[PDB]
Subunit: 332 residues, 3 copies
């Protein structure tokens, strides 16, 4: 049984086929690939684009999406095995995934880490549990990685540059400020897809403490050897932006401080100048800027940058709809 | 780009066409005006009729409605420009409206005032923000006015009286009691549509403090000159009901007390006798009674009045479905 | 007007026809029995299977389900008549049921008791109110009984045993442990359907205090006389399980303690050995085990029992989808 948990799990040819099918769906949105079929969108966290894009995608392909929010409308779920369920959880993922598998043809799942034990979070327990117990294909709607975002992002870049081949492009994945620590998922995914596409990647962050988990630094290195790009880490803004073709921002809490954010607060606070602004973008090679959204204006990026014609965030968000339809069509 | 934010923005001919298309849809509910199309119903406040009627309306016309509740499932939204988004809001309406515009063909929005600063509330910021940034038509699902309710109400009256022409009808918009201050939206809308239809309107309220915002008193005066009706303010129940053909109730907090309800409480409390009862209705010319709902029984109106054959509240509620389908069909 | 509030309200022939139509729908899931029609699923409590199965069922038959949660998205509802609605409720069920009846073709309702006054809860006020005021058929999605679960359960048993006739089967309805008191609905329903099918039923519970309401003990006795089975009460585990063909578990709070759970806690706590385990199941005649779900593992039943091939809980859950489609098709 094939799932869509991470692009890293798929061959380059399969990924290229997904991207191409996404372009096709963008030209002909209505279809019958999911006629009479359904998908359960299980949300453990908030969402606007993902929920809307998946729900509409199913509809446009003749299918139906059932939106579930455990703890809100559905029952809270337990993921640990062999435990005595006398706590807050009502049922085990084993029964939930099996039951859903008797109803729907696909299951999507969104579950951000709890930001208390990166050791536990990095295990991707929720997503892995669904993939293990479900009799139907499972789709990552974002946990510790965000593969659907990766493809939407990649398609947006290919469209912007007018070609599927992005080799030779300088790509800057930049950390950005926020008072609270956020999920590294999007950052981990960008690093993964940028290198899998063979671009020259630079991970720009305030200090070595903000470097991404080794799992993703390794996927990147492996992808660079495979695609012909390159990986690099930097803590110097100007040399990072200089001549860049793409600038992708995202805010995340330093991994080494998971479960102890009190001391890392004064650290990130001295780096709010990492905000993407005109001065920085002016240093690029007329580079494009994008963000996964939601984006806090004048925090992650200034109003001026968001409204400039070089911002393709809206295009990337639109593409979530098209690439996800390709994913659902491939798995069904 | 044409939106449906207020009936006052549309010509009389366009409104008549909407009402007529609504009557047509009431006779043939299934259609294909929205085949393959979608609408995002963004709710910032509770709703039963609006959500249900819009969702079903889209379905019956071959479309699909995506129900969103910022702060509940979707991310909280920021509407002020140039602000540093380091508060509770996650994204700006600029990105939300643009993103949604890449997914759906229409956007509906519901957002009641906060009852703290009528000066701010009366600006209709949320609705105006959507209308400004959205690339697709926007529909008011109730903010400070309730245009969809206006049409459902107008159609119900036309059906009850057996004619599209309501000139010559005595219409009583009456304030009613409630311990807490409520939105004037429905009252503002009734005053607007009753006068646009050319009826003889009387705004019955406890004191001058309960008079509606000047914006709507002005729309009314302008509508009276245009339609041939008349506007009048009264604080005397008996002379108001006498010979009335229509009695429409609604409870609202006095505008002059927005942000300071402590002192206006003892004021409204001495007027709970404004409740619509049999004694009052008996004074009318076998007049019909209606309310937008939800309605608190034996508070806004007595059980006897709600169950009498002259109560057309259920018919008006049904019409929300039909007039909204006409609105969606016209904007698409 | 015919509703589906309890199987006890339907003749045996009608129930057999429902079960048969459910089997047909299980073989051909797509149909047009609800083409262009809709159902309002009103949830006053959490749900995963019911919401998902009803929503998908409507879709597969060409219809559309509108999911409503009073107090969450829809307005809170009042069920008492003649009261002065100046409390938490916004509208009366009279208007809600009538309005919904102008929109949808069917109404489903879920509302668990409040566990404070079994005398009040046992009146099934919510369900009865909907059935009284609604102009369209009403479906019990679980209140104090769970008729949709009854049919899913019955179909699962008929499929397991390879025959529609279950007479001669030893059926054990067993109480199971949980720190908090739960609804007897599922237990009341199992007792009802097991006896209506003519099986030899044994209600196994810790003490006479855990015996089900007399209303259901009476339905059972009446059903036994009609179907040829038998009813029995027991507080001895071993003699209950011995030679049993079916074991159905469920946890519920002792009725005599509604509104005073402090003293009944130490009582149930000495009976957590009622948990369904291998030792108990080994005593049966290779009996099948099932539960309505959600199920707390290693509390209601052990991991080993849930994962054994004799557990048909997943099949029963799947059947909720099929029997409900038969119910909707029959009522429409
Ligand atoms: C603040 C916050 O927690 N943000 C998330 C955004 C995830 C990417 N964004 C999306 O997938 C779009 P939508 O479906 O609308 O959420 C994060 O940091 O991972
Ligand atoms: C108490 C309260 O806040 N009431 C609202 C009702 C609005 C009119 N009613 C509707 O649009 C119907 P539905 O979609 O079910 O809300 C108000 O006073 O403006
Ligand atoms: C713990 C709890 O309160 N449980 C409920 C389960 C009802 C049966 N179960 C269902 O109908 C399945 P779903 O639609 O997913 O809830 C009870 O005890 O009655």
């Amino acid at each position: 049984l094939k799932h869509f948990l991470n692009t890293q799990d798929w061959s380059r040819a399969e990924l290229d086929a997904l991207l191409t099918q996404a372009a096709l769906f963008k030209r002909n949105k209505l279809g019958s690939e999911l006629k009479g079929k359904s998908i359960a969108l299980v949300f453990f966290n908030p969402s606007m684009r993902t929920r809307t894009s998946f729900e509409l995608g199913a509809f446009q392909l003749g299918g139906h999406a059932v939106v579930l929010q455990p703890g809100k409308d559905a029952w809270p779920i337990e993921f640990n095995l062999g435990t005595v369920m006398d706590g807050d959880t009502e049922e085990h993922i084993a029964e939930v995934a099996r039951v859903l598998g008797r109803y729907v043809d696909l299951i999507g799942v969104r579950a951000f880490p709890k930001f208390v034990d990166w050791s536990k979070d990095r295990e991707d327990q929720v997503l892995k549990s669904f993939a293990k117990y479900s009799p139907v294909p499972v789709i990552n709607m974002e946990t510790i990685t965000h593969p659907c975002q990766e493809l939407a992002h990649a398609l947006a870049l290919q469209e912007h540059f007018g070609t599927p081949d992005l080799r030779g492009k300088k790509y800057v994945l930049t950390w950005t400020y926020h008072p609270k620590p956020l999920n590294t998922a999007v950052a981990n995914s960008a690093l993964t897809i940028a290198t899998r596409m063979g671009m020259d990647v630079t991970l720009l962050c305030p200090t070595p403490d903000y470097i991404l988990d080794e799992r993703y630094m390794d996927w990147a290195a492996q992808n660079v050897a495979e695609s012909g790009g390159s990986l690099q880490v930097s803590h110097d803004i100007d040399s990072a932006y200089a001549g860049a073709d793409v600038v992708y921002a995202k805010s995340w809490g330093a991994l080494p401080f998971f479960g102890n954010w009190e001391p890392e607060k004064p650290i990130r606070d001295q780096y709010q100048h990492f905000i993407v602004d005109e001065r920085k973008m002016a240093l690029t090679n007329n580079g494009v800027f994008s963000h996964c959204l939601p984006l806090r204006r004048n925090v992650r990026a200034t109003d001026a940058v968001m409204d400039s014609p070089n911002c393709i965030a809206i295009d990337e968000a639109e593409n979530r709809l098209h690439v996800q339809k390709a994913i659902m069509a491939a798995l069904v």
